């Protein structure tokens, strides 16, 4: 079940979307985060994404709704392609490995300022074989909660 550590981590993640700190993520905020990741949704696709997670139907996502979404899990059968595309946003040089440098660049473009200690830790926790990098297989497992 949801650990307290995961809750604080998810609250941190929540703040990457909730730019203005008003406690809700709007389509505008979702749009700017997606664009920072090289994605380009239309105002309509942005609305569908919010509506899939919007529980009380008020058009925006508050922390409980985000936590709920984040809390839940699915198998790798759940669009391996989405995972593939996400991997590609990190693996900027296309070599098949996410380096600490690549992880840092992505985070910075997202507006998250990590030190060296934090980047290595994020890497260390996803790294299975111990080479200090995250390959696609390691990435998949991080995502599929297994
Ligand atoms: C001031 N100092 C700034 C950096 N933040 C957290 C750094 C990134 N971070 C992180 C890194 C290592 C170990 C735990 C965590 S919590 C966390 C949760 C989500 C994200 C995310 F957002 F990337 F998904 C990033 C982090 C801690 C406080
Ligand atoms: C049922 N299953 C669960 C719901 N979604 C998963 C996450 C929802 N959502 C989303 C939708 C489409 C594509 C990517 C994403 S990531 C994401 C990030 C933030 C939010 C935001 F902003 F709303 F918080 C909503 C989403 C897929 C379908
Ligand atoms: C639950 N247990 C811990 C979580 N995962 C590893 C998560 C590593 N990870 C991370 C770690 C702490 C805080 C936030 C994040 S988000 C994130 C994003 C990219 C990567 C990247 F790019 F390196 F792969 C790794 C992580 C492994 C299983
Ligand atoms: C428990 N089960 C719940 C669902 N997933 C959530 C996705 C992984 N994720 C993550 C992992 C550990 C700690 C914090 C986070 S927030 C986060 C932010 C970005 C990414 C990234 F990298 F994709 F950009 C991945 C994650 C984790 C495992
Ligand atoms: Ca907001
Ligand atoms: Ca809502
Ligand atoms: Ca790479
Ligand atoms: Ca590795």
Q: Quick count: other Cβ atoms within 10 Å of Cβ 21?
A: 7
Question: Do 99 and 131 meet the contact criterion of CB atoms below 8 Å apart?
Answer: no
Question: Do 144 and 75 meet the contact criterion of CB atoms below 8 Å apart?
Answer: yes
Instruction: Quote the CA–CA distance of 57 and 74 in Å, as a whole number.
Output: 23
Residues in Cβ contact with 100 at an 8 Å cutoff, skipping those fewer than 6 apart: 116, 119, 120, 123, 132, 133
Long-range CB contact pairs, 16-24, < 8 A, 24+:
16/110, 16/111, 16/112, 17/61, 17/66, 19/111, 23/62, 23/63, 24/60, 24/61, 24/62
The beta strand positions in the chain, using DSSP E, are 24-25, 61-62, 97-98, 134-135
- N residues, the chain: 146
Total tally of structural domains belonging to the chain: 1
Q: Is 16's C-beta closer than 6 angstroms to any atom of ligand 2?
A: no
Residue 51 C-alpha from the chain's centroid: 18
- Ligand 5 centre from 18 Cα, in Å? 4
DSSP annotation of 13: H
Instruction: Quote the CA–CA distance of 62 and 89 in Å, as a whole number.
Output: 26
User: In angstroms, what is the resolution?
Assistant: 2.0
Residues in Cβ contact with 79 at an 8 Å cutoff, skipping those fewer than 6 apart: none
Q: If you search the block for the tokens 């925006």, which residue do you land on?
A: 60
Assigned token pair, 25: 């993520």
User: Residue 99 belongs to a domain with what CATH number?
Assistant: 1.10.238.10
User: Which residue's CA is minimally distant from atom 7 of ligand 1?
Assistant: 114
Substitution candidate for ligand 3 out of 142, 143, 144, 146 with most atoms within 8 A of CB: 142
Instruction: Quote the CA–CA distance of 22 and 45 in Å, as a whole number.
Output: 23
Residue 64 C-alpha from the chain's centroid: 17
Question: Do 34 and 41 meet the contact criterion of CB atoms below 8 Å apart?
Answer: yes
| Domain that residue 93 falls in | 1-146
Instruction: Quote the CA–CA distance of 107 and 40 in Å, as a whole number.
Output: 18
C-alpha distances out from residue 36 to 22, 39, 86, 103, Å: 20, 7, 13, 14
C-alpha distances out from residue 95 to 78, 134, 137, Å: 24, 11, 14
Count, in order, helices (H) and strands (E) of the chain. Answer: 8, 4
* Determination technique for this entry: X-ray
Assigned token pair, 86: 């996400």
């Amino acid at each position: 079940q949801l650990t307290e550590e995961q809750i604080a981590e998810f609250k941190e993640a929540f703040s990457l979307f909730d730019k203005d700190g008003d406690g809700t993520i709007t389509t505008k905020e979702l749009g700017t985060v997606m664009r920072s990741l090289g994605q380009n949704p239309t105002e309509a696709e942005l609305q569908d994404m919010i509506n899939e997670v919007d529980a009380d139907g008020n058009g925006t996502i508050d922390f409980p709704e985000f936590l709920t979404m984040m809390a839940r899990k699915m198998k790798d059968t759940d669009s391996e392609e989405e995972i593939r595309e996400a991997f590609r946003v990190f693996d900027k040089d296309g070599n098949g490995y996410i380096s600490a440098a690549e992880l840092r660049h992505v985070m910075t473009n997202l507006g998250e300022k990590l030190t060296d200690e934090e980047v290595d830790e994020m890497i260390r926790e996803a790294d299975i074989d111990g080479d200090g990098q995250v390959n696609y297989e390691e990435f998949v497992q991080m995502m599929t909660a297994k």
